[PDB]
Design a protein around this ligand. Structure first.
Ligand SMILES: C[C@H](CS)C(=O)NCB(O)O
Length: 264
């Protein structure tokens, strides 16, 4: 990946104080926009999108998986598990857990689904199975948010995120019903209104999955975007910063997303 008009990104990055990672593709034209697209960034909660897709893939082999109820315990409830906490007394189905992980970044739901898939190694294996050799999940919630500079655990690249997202939402990695369900969950996300969505024209449909580590200025968003009458755009925007106390910036994510969309 290159970019011969990178200076707007470089200037945004300098103003941010950290590192910005962008990859965007117009699936109609094959045009792309790149900045640190090959460099590793922490996934934070953005892994939860791929987790839901992995669950949907498994559902293609196990009938009834999505409808299976899980009666989880109180000590499954790690901080920021708003749906799992609300539904603790009833339990939740696998489908509901997937929707909560995607649309609310629900931490307990993600861990419960990781367990059904064989842990971080199992999700990493799923990603390897669709041709993604960059993605690695190593730890569970909340430990995977440590976001330590240079630590390759729980990281991917903006390009590999975008490519895998395209395969699962638009390609043939998932069967058609599973694929539509994944897209529908992403379109229903509630956590992303100040990130990529804030850069997309009001009349374009969007689904997205955010991540926020809470340390080292580290936060992100990826999305499928449907321009009027066109094939969709798929993009990923990731950030990090060198100091543990550096604040993440949603505005920086939105601005980088806008630069990518304008570049296309
Ligand atoms: C620790 C942090 C507080 S916002 C969190 O729960 N992130 C979920 B994710 O992995 O982004």
């Amino acid at each position: 990946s290159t970019n011969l008009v990178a200076e707007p990104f470089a200037k945004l990055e300098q103003d941010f104080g950290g590192s910005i990672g962008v990859y965007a593709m117009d699936t109609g034209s094959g045009a792309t926009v790149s900045y640190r697209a090959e460099e590793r960034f922490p996934l934070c909660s953005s892994f939860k999108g791929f987790l839901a897709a992995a669950v949907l893939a498994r559902s293609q082999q196990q009938a009834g998986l999505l409808d299976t109820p899980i009666r989880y315990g109180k000590n499954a409830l790690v901080p920021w598990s708003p749906i799992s906490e609300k539904y603790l007394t009833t339990g939740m189905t696998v489908a509901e857990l997937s929707a909560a992980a995607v649309q609310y970044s629900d931490n307990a739901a993600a861990n419960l689904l990781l367990k059904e898939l064989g842990g971080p190694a199992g999700l990493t294996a799923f990603m390897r199975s669709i041709g993604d050799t960059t993605f690695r999940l190593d730890r569970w919630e909340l430990e995977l948010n440590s976001a330590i500079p240079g630590d390759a655990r729980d990281t991917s690249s903006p390009r590999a995120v975008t490519e895998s997202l395209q395969k699962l939402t638009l390609g043939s990695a998932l069967a058609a019903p599973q694929r539509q369900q994944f897209v529908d969950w992403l379109k229903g996300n509630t956590t992303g209104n100040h990130r990529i969505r804030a850069a997309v024209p009001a009349d374009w449909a969007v689904g997205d999955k955010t991540g926020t580590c809470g340390v080292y200025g580290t936060a992100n968003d990826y999305a499928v975007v449907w321009p009027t009458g066109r094939a969709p755009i798929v993009l990923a925007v990731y950030t990090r910063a060198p100091n543990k106390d550096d604040k993440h910036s949603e505005a920086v994510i939105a601005a980088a997303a806008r630069l990518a969309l304008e570049g296309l």
